Amino acid sequence: TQYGDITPAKNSGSLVRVTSSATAGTEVSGTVLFNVRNATELPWLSGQGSRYSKYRVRYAHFTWEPIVGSNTNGEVAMAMLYDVADVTSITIERLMQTRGGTWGPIWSPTRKRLSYDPEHASLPWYLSGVSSGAAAGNIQTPFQIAWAAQSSLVSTTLGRIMAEYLVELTDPVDVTINQ
Amino acid sequence: GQQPTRQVTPVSAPAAMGTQITYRGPQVVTQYGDITPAKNSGSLVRVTSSATAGTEVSGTVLFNVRNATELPWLSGQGSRYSKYRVRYAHFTWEPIVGSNTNGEVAMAMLYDVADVTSITIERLMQTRGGTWGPIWSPTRKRLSYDPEHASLPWYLSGVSSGAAAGNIQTPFQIAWAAQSSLVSTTLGRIMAEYLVELTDPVDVTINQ
Amino acid sequence: GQQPTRQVTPVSAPAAMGTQITYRGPQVVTQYGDITPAKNSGSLVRVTSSATAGTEVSGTVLFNVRNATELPWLSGQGSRYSKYRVRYAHFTWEPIVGSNTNGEVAMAMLYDVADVTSITIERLMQTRGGTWGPIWSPTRKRLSYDPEHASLPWYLSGVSSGAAAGNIQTPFQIAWAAQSSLVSTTLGRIMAEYLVELTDPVDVTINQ
Amino acid sequence: TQYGDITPAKNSGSLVRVTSSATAGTEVSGTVLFNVRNATELPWLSGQGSRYSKYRVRYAHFTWEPIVGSNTNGEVAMAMLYDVADVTSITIERLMQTRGGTWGPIWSPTRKRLSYDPEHASLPWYLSGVSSGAAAGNIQTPFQIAWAAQSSLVSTTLGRIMAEYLVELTDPVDVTINQ
Amino acid sequence: TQYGDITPAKNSGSLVRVTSSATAGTEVSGTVLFNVRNATELPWLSGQGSRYSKYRVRYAHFTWEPIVGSNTNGEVAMAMLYDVADVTSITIERLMQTRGGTWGPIWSPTRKRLSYDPEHASLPWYLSGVSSGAAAGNIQTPFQIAWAAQSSLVSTTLGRIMAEYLVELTDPVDVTINQ
Numbered sequence: 041t042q043y044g045d046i047t048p049a050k051n052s053g054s055l056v057r058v059t060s061s062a063t064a065g066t067e068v069s070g071t072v073l074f075n076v077r078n079a080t081e082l083p084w085l086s087g088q089g090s091r092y093s094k095y096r097v098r099y100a101h102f103t104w105e106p107i108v109g110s111n112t113n114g115e116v117a118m119a120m121l122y123d124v125a126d127v128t129s130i131t132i133e134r135l136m137q138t139r140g141g142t143w144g145p146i147w148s149p150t151r152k153r154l155s156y157d158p159e160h161a162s163l164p165w166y167l168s169g170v171s172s173g174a175a176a177g178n179i180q181t182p183f184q185i186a187w188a189a190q191s192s193l194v195s196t197t198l199g200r201i202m203a204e205y206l207v208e209l210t211d212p213v214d215v216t217i218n219q
Numbered sequence: 220g221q222q223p224t225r226q227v228t229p230v231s232a233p234a235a236m237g238t239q240i241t242y243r244g245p246q247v248v249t250q251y252g253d254i255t256p257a258k259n260s261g262s263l264v265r266v267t268s269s270a271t272a273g274t275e276v277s278g279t280v281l282f283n284v285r286n287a288t289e290l291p292w293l294s295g296q297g298s299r300y301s302k303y304r305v306r307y308a309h310f311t312w313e314p315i316v317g318s319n320t321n322g323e324v325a326m327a328m329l330y331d332v333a334d335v336t337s338i339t340i341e342r343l344m345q346t347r348g349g350t351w352g353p354i355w356s357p358t359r360k361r362l363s364y365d366p367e368h369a370s371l372p373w374y375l376s377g378v379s380s381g382a383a384a385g386n387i388q389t390p391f392q393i394a395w396a397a398q399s400s401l402v403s404t405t406l407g408r409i410m411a412e413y414l415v416e417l418t419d420p421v422d423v424t425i426n427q
Numbered sequence: 428g429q430q431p432t433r434q435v436t437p438v439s440a441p442a443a444m445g446t447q448i449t450y451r452g453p454q455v456v457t458q459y460g461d462i463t464p465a466k467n468s469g470s471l472v473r474v475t476s477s478a479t480a481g482t483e484v485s486g487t488v489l490f491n492v493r494n495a496t497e498l499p500w501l502s503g504q505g506s507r508y509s510k511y512r513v514r515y516a517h518f519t520w521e522p523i524v525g526s527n528t529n530g531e532v533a534m535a536m537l538y539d540v541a542d543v544t545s546i547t548i549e550r551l552m553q554t555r556g557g558t559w560g561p562i563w564s565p566t567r568k569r570l571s572y573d574p575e576h577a578s579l580p581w582y583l584s585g586v587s588s589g590a591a592a593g594n595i596q597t598p599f600q601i602a603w604a605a606q607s608s609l610v611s612t613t614l615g616r617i618m619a620e621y622l623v624e625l626t627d628p629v630d631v632t633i634n635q
Numbered sequence: 636t637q638y639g640d641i642t643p644a645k646n647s648g649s650l651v652r653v654t655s656s657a658t659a660g661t662e663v664s665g666t667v668l669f670n671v672r673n674a675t676e677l678p679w680l681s682g683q684g685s686r687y688s689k690y691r692v693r694y695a696h697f698t699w700e701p702i703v704g705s706n707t708n709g710e711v712a713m714a715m716l717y718d719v720a721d722v723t724s725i726t727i728e729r730l731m732q733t734r735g736g737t738w739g740p741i742w743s744p745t746r747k748r749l750s751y752d753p754e755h756a757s758l759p760w761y762l763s764g765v766s767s768g769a770a771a772g773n774i775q776t777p778f779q780i781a782w783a784a785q786s787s788l789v790s791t792t793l794g795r796i797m798a799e800y801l802v803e804l805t806d807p808v809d810v811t812i813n814q
Numbered sequence: 815t816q817y818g819d820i821t822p823a824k825n826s827g828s829l830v831r832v833t834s835s836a837t838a839g840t841e842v843s844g845t846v847l848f849n850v851r852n853a854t855e856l857p858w859l860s861g862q863g864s865r866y867s868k869y870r871v872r873y874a875h876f877t878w879e880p881i882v883g884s885n886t887n888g889e890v891a892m893a894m895l896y897d898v899a900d901v902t903s904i905t906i907e908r909l910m911q912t913r914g915g916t917w918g919p920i921w922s923p924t925r926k927r928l929s930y931d932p933e934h935a936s937l938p939w940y941l942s943g944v945s946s947g948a949a950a951g952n953i954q955t956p957f958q959i960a961w962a963a964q965s966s967l968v969s970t971t972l973g974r975i976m977a978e979y980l981v982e983l984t985d986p987v988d989v990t991i992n993q
Contacts, residue, residue: 052553052557053549054548054552065267105560106561109528109563110317111234111319111527112317113320115408136242137292138242139242140242142239142240145315147561149560149561202559234442235439236439237438238435239436240434242432243430243432243434256428260433442885443884445919445922446918447917448917450893450915461752469907470910475839499911509717509718509734510717510757523887523888523920527885579758581755582757586720589768591771592720592769595770611838612966613839613887627734628734629721629733629734630724630730633724633729635723
């Protein structure tokens with residue numbers, strides 16, 4: 041197969057901004073879908089997912105980016121999920137029991153990054169689509185990043201979750217038709 | 220000429236101490252005999268400050284193959300076996316607070332599911348396994364289980380309600396107490412790495 | 428028996444991190460060809476907080492042999508040569524603040540003298556060269572120029588006003604953005620070590 | 636790539652006629668753009684620049700051609716510039732400080748010729764165009780020849796500046812469209 | 815030449831007290847002349863400069879002495895100048911481009927000290943004098959210490975600039991005549 045058939049998208053960026061609960065010390069959870077179509081958290085990537093039919097993730101590393109001082113009193117955790125249907129009960133003690141679970145103090149930048157395991161992809165090429173539904177979801181997104189944090193600080197942004205990746209897109213499509 | 224007159228040791232404290240922890244996965248292997256070793260680690264308790272500043276907070280945890288609350292993973296294993304015993308279990312303190320903070324923490328080991336009241340720091344310090352230290356710093360000495368003194372060669376994977384029944388199904392409990400000038404703030408977590416040996420398989424439905 | 432279940436890493440933060448820097452002097456050498464390598468280092472920008480706490484501050488710097496504002500030394504060289512090109516250029520963040528402080532910083536590389544608006548942290552993070560981190564800590568990964576992708580084998584030592592003229596005289600720019608809870612306080616500086624090759628001498632008066 | 640795609644234009648010719656100031660002994664300056672489009676000083680070359688899109692200079696040597704006797708009292712100088720914007724303050728003492736600067740007595744034919752340095756070209760292929768402007772200028776012309784002379788003689792032509800070159804043109808264009 | 819003809823003055827002391835601007839975050843500059851006659855900042859030394867005609871500096875090391883806590887938000891810089899006439903535009907980014915320039919955080923005591931380079935002295939023996947004027951100045955003082963600092967703190971003394979030196983004096987003079 042010739043050159044060009046696969047287009048690599050290598051870049052990084054802020055996945056999400058993690059901000060504390062309005063009630064001091066209350067865990068805050070979240071789940072982020074890794075898509076070429078998640079325009080909210082993967083803008084740069086989304087602008088391309090939209091113009092290609094299929095895609096696959098070559099590699100993706102996630103890390104915690106703190107933006108609060110050393111005296112802050114919080115904790116953070118991340119793990120990788122592979123079922124779009126898994127969206128509840130995201131607690132810290134649970135992420136610490138699921139694949140890649142990384143926990144640490146709020147002020148500390150992640151040392152041992154969390155990474156995608158491609159050799160276990162549920163399928164060769166995922167679809168650049170938006171069809172709602174659990175099944176449809178798992179066929180359009182390879183994995184998700186579950187996270188949970190907590191802090192005595194009230195309604196303050198603690199930091200972000202960074203992502204350094206490289207994904208390959210294939211089969212160009214018209215932005216409009218492709219939706 | 221002569222020997223030294225004193226011994227100087229440089230001491231220092233950072234703005235904040237802590238620990239990052241990445242989960243690698245549980246370790247399970249079937250072996251000859253009926254023995255099958257389950258190894259794992261994770262968070263045990265989320266220790267949070269008292270609503271009244273400086274007041275002590277406390278509690279205890281049952282070490283069970285069927286304690287779905289704190290040892291969820293282990294429960295999955297426990298549900299399929301009839302008996303078990305602990306090879307080793309080590310508990311440790313992990314700070315979420317800066318060194319600026321005031322307070323202290325302590326934990327020890329109990330061997331009677333019934334003893335669950337009057338837990339306090341000064342009291343845990345005189346209980347076997349006593350570990351402690353300023354709240355803001357990870358615990359140096361860890362808390363380890365002592366299987367040579369187990370009351371039962373093999374404990375039961377059951378859920379019967381009694382106090383005795385509890386002691387026949389639980390080899391020990393983790394008592395802990397802490398206090399801090401902070402108010403209703405999560406001070407840190409107690410981590411655990413352990414290895415238990417399950418034996419005598421049984422259908423989960425029946426094992427209840 | 429088995430492998431580990433987790434991986435523990437001790438983490439810590441000092442009251443304040445920083446860097447002392449002593450200037451050793453610029454390095455210049457004439458060589459065969461018309462090539463003459465200029466090597467130097469220094470401060471690029473003095474990054475100072477917004478008057479409105481927490482608000483983002485930003486800006487960009489043109490990499491020029493004739494940017495008397497931020498690269499004064501390099502200007503002296505630029506004024507005497509007609510063309511040049513960058514061998515390497517690395518930029519880095521240096522904190523003047525204690526670890527107690529809140530905020531973050533980020534920088535990346537741009538290649539069009541015209542793109543100088545809408546600079547923000549979240550946006551620099553998705554731009555080539557993106558580096559970032561809590562404001563109080565020196566930047567681990569540095570920002571380096573990529574000469575293999577230069578648009579011109581040799582750029583011009585000129586000062587013409589156009590946007591195109593600007594791109595013909597500037598191989599790249601440094602975008603950066605930062606925010607902090609502090610108000611109108613100088614957060615730190617962006618340092619730079621670089622090496623450029625000047626060529627084709629010319630009387631300074633005329634080179635303008 | 637096949638034969639013919641690049642057309643070599645090898646030739647020489649008079650660049651400019653240098654004539655003295657009306658006021659005896661006053662330096663006279665000048666700047667000549669090396670273009671496939673400078674019809675005033677590079678006629679032969681210009682007639683081709685006009686019918687090709689891009690081009691590059693393989694080599695170019697400049698020399699002073701005196702046409703006045705040994706008793707004449709003047710001096711001449713040349714140097715090479717690479718910014719179309721550099722057009723003022725062209726004095727002899729300055730050319731003698733810029734690349735290739737060659738100075739000598741008026742009656743004497745240049746010995747050590749001035750030459751273009753291709754390995755330093757600002758770009759691979761220059762454009763055969765006429766768009767005015769500094770930037771546009773530098774993209775259409777690779778370099779210029781700055782010169783300055785002076786002589787007690789009044790308003791008399793001292794000599795010429797010769798050019799022996801070889802430039803390669805590429806991409807034919809219609810003479811009209813190309814402007 | 816016999817013993818005694820040269821008198822060594824070895825000692826150290828506080829050069830200057832660096833105090834912040836009344837307007838938070840405004841750089842504060844300064845220049846200190848290294849004299850046997852600068853009674854304001856080199857008292858101990860000055861009391862001898864006054865009674866000797868000439869002198870030279872064997873060695874001199876300067877360092878930053880902070881007196882404010884780790885949480886302070888400032889920066890400091892020093893460099894060495896050799897022209898008494900150089901007294902303006904003393905900014906941090908500039909000191910960092912001049913000889914020996916040392917920059918660092920406000921709370922941190924200098925590690926790599928700044929030192930005088932005797933082998934480059936403009937002259938063998940300097941004069942213990944006070945005559946005003948640029949020239950006269952450069953003949954009485956071998957060098958100066960330029961410094962600049964800034965801090966969010968308002969009108970507070972940040973620290974001092976220390977000096978550990980050894981200078982040789984020669985040719986005793988009457989304190990009065992010598993002025």
